[PDB]
Amino acid sequence: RTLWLRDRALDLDRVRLLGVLNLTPPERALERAREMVAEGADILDLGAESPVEEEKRRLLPVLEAVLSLGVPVSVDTRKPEVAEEALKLGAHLLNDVTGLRDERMVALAARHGVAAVVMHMPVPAHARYRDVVAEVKAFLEAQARRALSAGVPQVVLDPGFGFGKLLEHNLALLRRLDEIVALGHPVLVGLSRKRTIGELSGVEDPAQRVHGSVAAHLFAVMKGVRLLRVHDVRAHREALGVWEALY
Amino acid sequence: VRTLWLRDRALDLDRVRLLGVLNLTPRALERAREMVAEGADILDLGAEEEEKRRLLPVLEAVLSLGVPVSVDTRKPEVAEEALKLGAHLLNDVTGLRDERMVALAARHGVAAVVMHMPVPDPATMMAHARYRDVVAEVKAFLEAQARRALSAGVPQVVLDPGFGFGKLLEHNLALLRRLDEIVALGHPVLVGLSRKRTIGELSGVEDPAQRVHGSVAAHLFAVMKGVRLLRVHDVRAHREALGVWEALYG
């Protein structure tokens, strides 16, 4: 399988990394991108919303600069206004947190010939499900179908670990992640420094959760995932160097 | 349930157990305290004579913590003094080829580790990494030494494929990929890839002290293959990784 990135195709024959760059409370962020690129990041994932709509000042300035590195860039935004601007600047992947529930986001991606990420999260986010795996699978597939039939070239599915989900829900989704991978679409996961990792590894500080995050991600890779959103790029590249040679 | 005999108690292998490395070669109670706090189930002490003055004094102090202690040594003289002091596990560095070590383990009622290496001499073993079938040959050596040790009175034997001992990357890779076949021999399996060349090669990390992420990855793979005993330098990192891994894969 391959991942379409607006004007290039990335093969998923090996695990690919999306290096996270959080622009939430500059030129001191461009070197961090060049830093992750040097560490092995395949895609740079920029997000500015944890805010008002003029979050364009938090993103666009950095986005344009980062785009000059020649590396694919994913933009995390809910607002179609922000996305459209990011796309006409060169964005390669549209990461919709609200699971593309916004028809404007769908239309945008289809119009720019860019793939979109469909992440799961409660309609609103209450962590209450009759069957979390069955429900998330259904939502992801249904949203993907809507996007594809609307013109979006490709859809990436993200279970949305941590979003409206308690430990039991995140565990269930991870254990049956192969079933989400079996829907055919490329699957993306991001458990870096998340509460789930803290809960299972006993690490109080989110900033010190690299080992549990790597462990969770290797498990996801074993389940068939080939796209990971991570904070510690180098740690994952080193771990994958070993893992991919053994599995 | 599967367990590991440790001189005067049994350790359940219902979950992965860690042997924290404490190398005393060119306080120790403190670091030992730290490793125990970090999650080490067994403390591995090795000073690889003068080997006695360096190990014994420390071994006695560390033993007072009440945590099982594994001792690594090639000299029976040191092993006997360590066992007489109370060490709980006899780790080998020659493949348990010395009958004297076998006798000590059985006499003191302690389990012994049988680690594979083509030849005991560390300076010549890389000249003996020419296996026709490394997995088959390592399995044969381990099972043979296991039978010999058990028949001589040793209560239990722990098998270690000896990663990085007289083995090319191709050999270490083959052994890791088919580690389940060694686990299938029925004895508890111990692996130690911490900071090893294999990790440096596959992860692209030249500094041995900076190989924790590749080591954790290799060890999680070993755990997936069935291994429940890991010899590690970074105890906390492994406890954190296992907290996640064991909750998921189980």
Side-chain angles (χ1 to χ4, degrees), chain A residues 170-171 174-175 196-197 200-203 208-216 218-219 222 232 234-247, chain B residues 172-173 176-177 198-199 202-205 210-218 220-221 224 236-250:
Chain A
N170 292 303
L171 280 175
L174 280 164
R175 288 169 179 160
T196 296
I197 303 307
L200 298 176
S201 69
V203 177
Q208 298 181 52
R209 295 173 183 164
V210 65
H211 299 117
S213 298
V214 165
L218 290 180
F219 183 94
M222 185 182 54
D232 201 319
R234 177 165 291 184
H236 282 80
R237 275 278 153 246
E238 293 172 1
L240 286 166
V242 170
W243 191 268
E244 298 188 294
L246 305 179
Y247 203 103
Chain B
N172 292 301
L173 284 176
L176 278 168
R177 293 170 179 161
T198 297
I199 304 304
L202 303 176
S203 73
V205 175
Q210 303 300 311
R211 293 169 178 168
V212 65
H213 292 303
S215 297
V216 167
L220 290 180
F221 184 89
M224 182 181 75
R236 184 173 57 176
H238 283 83
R239 275 278 151 244
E240 288 164 6
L242 289 167
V244 171
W245 192 268
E246 294 185 295
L248 296 176
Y249 203 127

Side-chain angles (χ1 to χ4, degrees), chain B residues 11 15-16 25 31 36 46 53 60 66 77-78 81 90 96 104 112 120 124 130 135 167 185 195 213 221:
Chain B
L11 177 61
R15 64 200 296 286
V16 176
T25 68
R31 173 52 176 168
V36 171
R53 90 182 227 64
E60 184 163 295
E77 304 68 57
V78 177
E81 291 304 299
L90 183 58
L96 196 60
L104 284 173
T124 75
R130 318 178 179 196
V135 177
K167 295 172 186 72
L185 292 172
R195 306 179 176 179
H213 292 303
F221 184 89

Side-chain angles (χ1 to χ4, degrees), chain A residues 60-140:
Chain A
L60 300 185
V62 182
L63 176 57
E64 189 180 306
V66 173
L67 291 172
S68 70
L69 297 180
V71 179
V73 181
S74 177
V75 56
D76 310 294
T77 184
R78 298 180 301 159
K79 313 175 184 312
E81 290 95 41
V82 182
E84 180 146 276
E85 299 301 303
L87 293 180
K88 64 180 186 180
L89 276 185
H92 307 91
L93 182 64
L94 187 59
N95 201 136
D96 178 303
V97 182
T98 58
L100 284 177
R101 286 195 175 78
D102 191 316
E103 292 184 60
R104 293 177 298 174
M105 289 293 256
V106 176
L108 276 167
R111 171 170 33 180
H112 290 66
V114 175
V117 178
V118 172
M119 188 189 321
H120 173 282
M121 70 198 314
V123 32
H126 293 86
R128 189 87 68 177
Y129 306 84
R130 298 160 293 192
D131 185 324
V132 71
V133 176
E135 293 180 52
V136 168
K137 186 188 296 171
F139 175 78
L140 291 173

Side-chain angles (χ1 to χ4, degrees), chain A residues 17-32:
Chain A
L17 303 176
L18 285 71
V20 177
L21 183 45
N22 292 172
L23 305 175
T24 65
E27 48 225 57
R28 193 169 183 174
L30 179 61
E31 193 177 304
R32 171 50 182 168

